[PDB]
Amino acid sequence: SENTIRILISSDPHVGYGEKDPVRGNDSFVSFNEILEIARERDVDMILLGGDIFHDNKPSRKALYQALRSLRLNCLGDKPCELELLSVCNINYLDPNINVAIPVFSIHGNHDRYSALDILQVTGLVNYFGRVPENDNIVVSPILLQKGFTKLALYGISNVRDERLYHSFRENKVKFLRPDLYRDEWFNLLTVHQNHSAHTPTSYLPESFIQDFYDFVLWGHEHECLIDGSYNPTQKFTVVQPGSTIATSLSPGETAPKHCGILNITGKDFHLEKIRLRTVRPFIMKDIILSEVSVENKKEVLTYLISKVEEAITEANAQWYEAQEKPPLPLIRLRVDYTGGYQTENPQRFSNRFVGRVANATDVVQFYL
């Protein structure tokens, strides 16, 4: 406990997504808050984030305020002054229960002077690292942290266009300034924000392009929770893609239940514990095939799908109780294949049928062939 660095790890909070929305318009704020709230409740030493912190490129004053609020309420702790408030600005003393500062560390995403990072960072609440100035020639300088005997090297690469990144690695334009003080005695963390898999080989970052000396790799960008990770035995590291904290579209990857994680680093071994996020709105997606189901057909399709949406709703309620009075309006998406001569309907029309019952007021279904 005295030589173990505790890092709460998450990614992609997307602060300010759907601000205007009359149902979901707060989700962003709430969950980014749950993230930092867990960190204090679980008493970690720092927070690491995978980038994509604000959604909008120029965030609202509301968004900026909300991130700041949650950052203070949880990560600032106690402020020292010889001035007591009788009726904080709160006297610290040197008590056993003293509220320490939990510094937040993040790289930048594709969303990420001045500048969203500038206001967070200048208040000393968020620390930005791994930023890249030239894409053609990158020089990654690490953060060096010491807790007890354990030493942690923290390397960062801010989001680079994947193709450009692909070539920079291939042409040797990505150097890692490693330290020579206690060389080979550091735990090396890499925090990136690129696609992990791609349709096109040059549009992602191959795990093989990441040098064997690294022990841990935090994977931003990708929103799907894969918090348990994977061990690359050729590069000898462990890759954790935490996923986002909010469902930023109705894709199958956003349906996997969101978590964050505490990375307990001691010396050179580590332990990672997954922690379910409660504040995230449930998202159940079902794929329906016309051929599988058993032409002048309206009633047969409509009743089935409407009773199939009411199926997902109760399945989504189940998982909010499992994740955790009334649960929040769930997100429901149906992918249906109406091949084989089946009578369809209007997409939004079907989605006006569930107003007040689902949170995605517009696209509850998509009809493909």
Is the Cβ of residue 105 or residue 350 nearer to a second copy in the bound state? 105
| CA dist list (Å): 61 to 19, 65, 112, 120, 257 | 11, 6, 17, 13, 30
Whichever of 44 and 316 has its CB closer to a second copy, that residue is 44
Residues linked to residue 201 through DSSP beta bridges, in sequence order: none
Residue 45, annotated as binding a ligand? no
Compute the residue count for the chain.
Answer: 369
Asked if residue 180 belongs to a known ligand binding site, the reply is no
Q: How many CB atoms lie within 10 A of CB 79?
A: 12
- The reply to whether 12 sits near Mn ion by the rule CB under 5 A is yes
Helix, strand, or coil (residue 200): coil
Q: How many CA atoms lie within 13 A of 366 on its CB side?
A: 11
Phi-psi region of 259 (alpha: psi -120 to 50; beta: other; left: phi over 0): beta
- Per-position x/- string for 156-195, each x denoting binding to a second copy as judged by CB under 8 A, each - no binding: -----------------------x----------------
Angle between helices 61-75 and 27-41 (to 10 degrees): 10
Q: Are 240 and 272 in contact (CB under 8 A)?
A: yes
Q: Residue 109: which of a second copy, Mn ion, none does it interact with, CB under 5 to 8 A by kind?
A: Mn ion
Amino acid found at 360: N
The neighbouring-strand residues paired with 264 are 6, 271
Q: Is 12 annotated as a binding residue?
A: yes
Cα–Cα separations (whole angstroms), residue 124 to 47, 142, 151, 191, 357: 14, 19, 23, 20, 42
* Residue 34, CA distances (Å) to 15, 31, 37, 73, 199 in order: 12, 5, 5, 11, 34
- Determine whether the annotation assigns residue 223 to a binding site: yes
The token pair that represents 104 in the structure block: 């937040």
Q: Name the token pair of 72.
A: 């203070």
If one asks whether residue 26 binds a second copy (CB under 8 A), the answer comes out as no
Find the shortest distance in angstroms from Cβ 219 to Mn ion.
11
Part in contact with Mn ion (CB under 5 A); list of ranges 10-18, 70-78, 196-204, 279-287: 10-18
Binds a second copy by CB under 8 A, chosen from 77, 252, 340, 347: 77
24 is a contact residue toward Mn ion (CB under 5 A): no
293 binds a second copy (CB under 8 A): no
Q: In angstroms, what is the minimal distance from the CB of 75 to Mn ion? A: 22
45 is a site residue for a second copy (CB under 8 A): yes
Distance CA 218, CA 227 (A): 10
Closer residue to Mn ion (CB): 59 or 109: 109
Longest dimension (CA), the chain: 82
Phi, psi of 230 (to 5 degrees): -165, 145
Partner that binds at residue 110, options Mn ion, a second copy, none, CB closer than 5 to 8 Å by kind: Mn ion
Residues noted as catalytic: 111
Q: Does 127 bind Mn ion (CB under 5 A)?
A: no
CA atoms within 13 A on the CB side of 211: 14
Token pair for 46: 């720092």
Copy the structure tokens of residue 12.
């992609």
Contact region with a second copy (CB under 8 A), list: 78-86, 261-269, 301-309, 349-357: 78-86
Q: Confirm or deny that 271 is annotated as ligand binding.
A: no
Per CB under 8 A, which of residues 106..135 are in contact with a second copy? 113-116, 118-119, 122-125, 127
Q: Which of 221, 259, 281, 333 binds Mn ion (CB under 5 A)?
A: 221
**Residue 123 touches which member of a second copy, Mn ion, none, C-beta under 5-8 Å by kind:** a second copy
Q: Which stretch binds Mn ion (CB under 5 A): 5-13, 34-42, 141-149, 314-322?
A: 5-13
**Residue 78 partner contact from a second copy, Mn ion, none using kind-dependent CB cut-offs of 5 to 8 Å:** a second copy
Answer yes or no: are the C-beta atoms of 124 and 104 closer than 8 Å: no
Question: Which chain residues interact with a second copy by CB under 8 A?
Answer: 2, 5, 45-46, 58, 60-62, 64-65, 68-69, 71-72, 76-87, 89, 94, 98, 100-103, 113-116, 118-119, 122-125, 127, 142-147, 151, 179
Annotated binding site for Mn(2+): 12, 14, 52, 110, 193, 221, 223
Known binding residues: 12, 14, 52, 110, 193, 221, 223
Which residues make up the interface to Mn ion (CB under 5 A)?
12, 52, 109-110, 221
